[PDB]
Amino acid sequence: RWRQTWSGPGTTKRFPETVLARCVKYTEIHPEMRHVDCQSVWDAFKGAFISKHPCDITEEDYQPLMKLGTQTVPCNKILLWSRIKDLAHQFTQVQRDMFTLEDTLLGYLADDLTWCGEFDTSKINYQSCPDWRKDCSNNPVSVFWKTVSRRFAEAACDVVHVMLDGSRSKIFDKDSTFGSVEVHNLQPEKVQTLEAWVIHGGREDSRDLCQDPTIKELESIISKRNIQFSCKNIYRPDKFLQCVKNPEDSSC
């Protein structure tokens, strides 16, 4: 229509088919997640938001999905990221040791998709979904990501890495998912160091972005959780990926 109920994009075309297909592929690739029934997962996921008002979703709504999507990941190999999506995933596509949330079953199913239902009916709304800013915070997509991102951060131990976009303006932004949920769910009992990799834009010869005021902020915040802080510039992200793909050979 010309009006729409909400300000955000509607459910992604082919959402149900896409989620199911992502689950078959994932559980096919990963030997640990081979016990999972992808139809059961879909039913659990749909159950969280179908016939529910899309401004009144809770983390409780996603409990059935979280249960079915339970996955042990090596706690010391987690890669968090903020606003530098492409390079973070290119990295874990080549360095199969480190994992982002989108490399877990639940993150993989949901990545880049939008979904919402209706309080009015049992249908999926393909026309519009609540915008976190203009409409309401407690919507199906926002609540999903808050819940899974908290649980992922809680799982981390030892040295946790985070890729940050050095071209942003707030390189560390306290209002990002990284800054507002994940930083505040790293467990002091478990996490030894948070190490940031600050990815430079282009150009070439830049400042040491590890001295940026927002990085000092992040450093002092995580200090309260009794977590040590490390920071590295990645001045040349292209050479960096090349080095990840071809380890050894002196250039790297």
Ligand X SMILES: Nc1ncnc2c1ncn2[C@@H]1O[C@H](COP(=O)(O)OP(=O)(O)OC[C@H]2O[C@H](O)[C@H](O)[C@@H]2O)[C@H](O)[C@H]1O
Catalytic residues: 75, 157
CB of 143 to ligand X, least distance (A): 9
Q: Which is nearer to ligand X, 70 or 122 (CB)?
A: 70
Q: What are phi and psi of 49, to 5 degrees?
A: -135, -20
Closer of 40 and 69 to ligand X (Cβ): 69
- Residue 102: CB minimum distance to ligand X, A: 6
From the number of C-beta atoms within 10 Å of its C-beta (0-12, 13-18, 19+), residue 220 rates as exposed
Contact between 101 and ligand X (CB under 6 A)?
A: yes
Q: Which of 178, 194, 209, 234 binds ligand X (CB under 6 A)?
A: 178
Interacting residues of 160 by C-beta distance below 8 A, sequence separation 6+: 78, 80, 186, 191, 193, 194, 195
Q: Does 82 bind ligand X (CB under 6 A)?
A: yes
Largest CA distance in the chain: 63
Does residue number 78 form part of the binding site for ligand X (CB under 6 A)?
no
Q: State the amino acid at position 181 in one-letter form.
A: V
CA dihedral 105→107→109→114, nearest 10 degrees, is: 170
**Of 83 and 200, CB closest to ligand X:** 83
Among 145, 172, 197, 240, binds ligand X (CB under 6 A): 145
**Tokens found for residue 206:** 């830049």
* Closer Cβ to ligand X, 86 or 120, answer by number: 86
Q: How far is the CB of 241 from ligand X (least distance, A)?
A: 19
Residues 146-165 that bind ligand X (CB under 6 A): 149
* DSSP H helical ranges for 69-169: 85-94, 105-110, 140-155
Comparison of 38 and 101: residue with beta carbon closer to ligand X: 101
Minimum Å distance from CB 61 to ligand X?
16
| Count, residues near ligand X per rule CB under 6 A | 11
CB of 174 to ligand X, least distance (A): 10
141 counts as binding ligand X under rule CB under 6 A: yes
Question: Any contact of residue 49 with ligand X (CB under 6 A)?
Answer: no
The minimum distance between CB 176 and ligand X, in angstroms, equals 3
Judging by beta carbons within 10 Å of its beta carbon (0-12, 13-18, 19+), is residue 104 exposed, middle or buried? buried
The mark string for 198-237 relative to ligand X (x by CB under 6 A, - otherwise) is: ----------------------------------------
For residue 197, the surrounding DSSP H or E stretch is strand 191-199
Alpha helix (H) residue ranges in the chain: 15-29, 38-47, 63-68, 85-94, 105-110, 140-155, 177, 213-224, 237-245
Query: 107 by DSSP, 3-state: which?
Result: helix
- Measured in whole angstroms, the distance separating CA 81 from the mean position of its chain's CA atoms is 7
The site for ligand X (CB under 6 A) is made up of: 81-83, 101, 141-142, 145, 149, 176-178
